[PDB]
Design a protein around this ligand. Sequence first.
Ligand SMILES: [Ca+2]
Ligand SMILES: [Ca+2]
Ligand SMILES: [Ca+2]
Ligand SMILES: [Ca+2]
Ligand SMILES: [Ca+2]
Ligand SMILES: [Ca+2]
Ligand SMILES: [Ca+2]
Ligand SMILES: [Ca+2]
Ligand SMILES: [Ca+2]
Ligand SMILES: [Ca+2]
Ligand SMILES: [Ca+2]
Ligand SMILES: [Ca+2]
Length: 389
Amino acid sequence: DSILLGATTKAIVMGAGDDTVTVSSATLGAGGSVNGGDGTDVLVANVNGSSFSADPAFGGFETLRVAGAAAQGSHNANGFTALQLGATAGATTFTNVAVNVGLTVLAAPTGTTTVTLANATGTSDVFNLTLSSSAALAAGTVALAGVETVNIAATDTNTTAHVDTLTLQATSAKSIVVTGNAGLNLTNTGNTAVTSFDASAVTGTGSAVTFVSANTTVGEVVTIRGGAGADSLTGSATANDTIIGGAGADTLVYTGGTDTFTGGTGADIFDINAIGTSTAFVTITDAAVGDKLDLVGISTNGAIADGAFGAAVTLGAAATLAQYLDAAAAGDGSGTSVAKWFQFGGDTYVVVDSSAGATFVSGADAVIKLTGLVTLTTSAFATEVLTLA
Ligand SMILES: [Ca+2]
Ligand SMILES: [Ca+2]
Ligand SMILES: [Ca+2]
Ligand SMILES: [Ca+2]
Ligand SMILES: [Ca+2]
Ligand SMILES: [Ca+2]
Ligand SMILES: [Ca+2]
Ligand SMILES: [Ca+2]
Ligand SMILES: [Ca+2]
Ligand SMILES: [Ca+2]
Ligand SMILES: [Ca+2]
Ligand SMILES: [Ca+2]
């Protein structure tokens, strides 16, 4: 059953089953009560602040939802087992939130949604955020200070695919796990403790996940996992990122350091935006027919080949990696950068020469490793984009 109440004078009962009362005023009147009865019942606060647990006038409720044209401000979560959020008048804050209590956002709110837990002090703090809508949902900013694992469910209620959006502010989260069946473009700015982003369980044709690590710990191991969608995963220059797309047209971005890329099934694009060193470079584990290698961001001097540029550099039975690099960079890349490639020790390498001498210079010349023997003979350069043939 489901009603709206104001400053009621009478004893409202809701009976069994999953009921819903929306209140327009925080305290009742005369006397002046509302009992949710048996089952999981939602109380909707269309008000400037609440403390329903304290008032014995309200009883039998399990879920607190902040939604309505007057819904706003500070709300005492105490004694609720779940939380919900809808459209709001202004910034709304949940205080005294017990452990294993999750928030479900159901519609775009107004202003930053702050969650502050009963006790944030431990180092194993878990929060369950849910996004649940038929259409694309702009969840806005939710702040979760002191939480270490943030779980996000992105849920689509209908059969037709969409992508939700969220700014998360979770400055001590080490893990973010995304589940669900809709896409999530997640704004991640300033969430610098994050070393594991796992959206791998996500499900549709295009439940597309976007993520960019804000991590700046020098020499960190960061793990970034995409889902079934056409995902857009960027690491950190600071970090040794392991990035893995799922199914679908994934874009994996290189920024610096020792990175390990695996675009799974589908036409993946490995977008190389940094030069790297001779030790800190990107290894692409599963480069296959259809995958692309976007070298626009290493065209230091001009813009790459543009041909089908495809005869492997060949050296002797025991030529060294150092030798093959120097050999590949032999030409002049001062006015115009050039691509070459070779196969050493069972793996395939691609080079960009941006220099004078026949030394591969660690700084401005670039190497990219590809696990296995992959023949790039027949494969062609689009703009500065190599499509594997
Ligand atoms: Ca009930
Ligand atoms: Ca109560
Ligand atoms: Ca109940
Ligand atoms: Ca939908
Ligand atoms: Ca904590
Ligand atoms: Ca946090
Ligand atoms: Ca994917
Ligand atoms: Ca990196
Ligand atoms: Ca993929
Ligand atoms: Ca692929
Ligand atoms: Ca690029
Ligand atoms: Ca050179």
